[PDB]
Design a protein around this ligand. Structure first.
Ligand SMILES: C[C@H](OCC1CCNCC1)c1cccc2c(-c3ccc(CS(C)(=O)=O)c(F)c3)c(C(=O)O)[nH]c12
Ligand SMILES: [Zn+2]
Ligand SMILES: [Zn+2]
Length: 232
């Protein structure tokens, strides 16, 4: 009823949308992995009379439910999707998107990692993002490669019209007490990558983590803090 949705409100298989700003929504879904249930976020950005999707809803059936929820709540076609790294909470559902006529994109680094791991593979390669600090435009967003953090390929997304920073899994929510699933992370580089985000996007007004509650710029420093304490 207006608060940011959580698992307790999200059975696995259902998707909720949350209005972040004019023409910007997050999507929230839940999934089981290794016997525990997790929420995860993605982004939807209005692109004229079409929509740009950032990240799947973590699974094929969740992603089908996402498309149905978008039709119900927004009613504009999703034409393109970008996956911000290679894990199943970002690419699981790309086959559903592709069969629904959505053009799917990711960096070559994400595509290679997805392929090697056996995850779903976005169709199109996003060049221009291979060095830390790189940025490119993609419809109504800027894509930014901050360097290795949660994964070596993680991208962040900025919505300039609304000063919305979508950190993806490189950014954690304020209530977090650990740095999430760090199996593919670079804990030593992560703070430097966060510092690059902070320098590049100092006017961000909303910061959205890959999992959990949006907040403000404090999510960035908090993420560095939890990662440094994990490493140590
Ligand atoms: C789909 C992804 O696959 C990872 C692979 C690694 C090893 N090879 C197989 C798959 C995955 C699976 C399960 C959990 C997570 C999480 C995760 C875990 C805990 C918390 C709560 S917290 C901040 O307080 O620790 C949280 F927010 C997020 C994250 C993430 O951190 O991005 N990613 C996850
Ligand atoms: Zn991940
Ligand atoms: Zn994640």
């Amino acid at each position: 009823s207006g608060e940011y949705p959580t698992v307790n409100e999200i059975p696995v298989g259902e998707v909720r949308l949350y209005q972040i700003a004019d023409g910007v929504w997050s999507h929230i879904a839940t999934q089981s992995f290794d016997g525990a249930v997790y929420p995860s976020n993605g982004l939807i950005v209005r692109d004229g009379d079409e929509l740009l999707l950032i990240d799947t809803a973590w699974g094929a059936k969740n992603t089908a439910a996402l498309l149905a929820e978008i039709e119900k709540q927004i009613g504009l076609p999703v034409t393109r999707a970008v996956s911000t790294h290679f894990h199943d909470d970002r690419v699981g559902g790309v086959d559903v998107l592709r069969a629904a006529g959505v053009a799917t994109y990711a960096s070559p680094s994400t595509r290679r990692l997805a392929e090697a791991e056996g995850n779903e593979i976005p169709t199109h390669s996003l060049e221009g993002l291979s060095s830390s600090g790189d940025a490119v435009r993609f419809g109504p967003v800027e894509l930014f490669y901050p360097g290795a953090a949660h994964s070596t390929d993680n991208l962040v997304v900025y919505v300039p019209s609304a000063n919305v920073l979508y950190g993806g899994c490189a950014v954690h929510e304020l209530s977090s007490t650990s740095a999430g699933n760090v199996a593919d992370a670079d804990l030593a580089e992560w703070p430097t990558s966060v510092e690059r985000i902070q320098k590049h996007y100092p006017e961000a007004e909303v910061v959205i983590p890959g999992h959990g509650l949006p907040g403000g710029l404090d999510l960035l420093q908090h993420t560095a803090n939890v990662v440094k304490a994990h490493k140590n």
